[PDB]
Amino acid sequence: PVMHPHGAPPNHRPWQMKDLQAIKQEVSQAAPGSPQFMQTIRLAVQQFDPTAKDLQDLLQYLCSSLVASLHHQQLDSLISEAETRGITSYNPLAGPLRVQANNPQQQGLRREYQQLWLAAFAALPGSAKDPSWA
Questions:
Q1: Which of the following CATH numbers is that of domain 1-134: 1.10.3720.10, 1.10.375.10, 1.10.260.40, 3.20.20.80?
Q2: Cα(19)–Cα(48) distance, rounded to whole angstroms?
Q3: How far apart are CA 8 and CA 14, in angstroms?
Q4: Closest CA relative to residue 74, chosen from 31, 33, 125, 128
């Protein structure tokens, strides 16, 4: 969870940032990134399903410029095919993504956008990453 209003200070929400760290000791355990990363980012993004906010400071701090670059490329087109498949004749996606999940009303795309989020975080090494440092 982190707030970043247009032209303002990054008002991050700590109070317990020692939980993303728990996912930091675990990226270690495995190889520089590797699928295993998803294993812990799975139970952390699948359990507390943080708002798109975290993705802002979780992808900009836990990852880095490059990774985020292609990590989303997966997503980019993933949505193109995720909705082609037949999610629901598409209804809320239409808007931006952070919008579908940052929506207490239409949360369906929050459990789905999370399933495609780790599919772009577990395919990182084999489709978008640099395990030569990661």
A1: 1.10.375.10
A2: 11
A3: 18
A4: 128
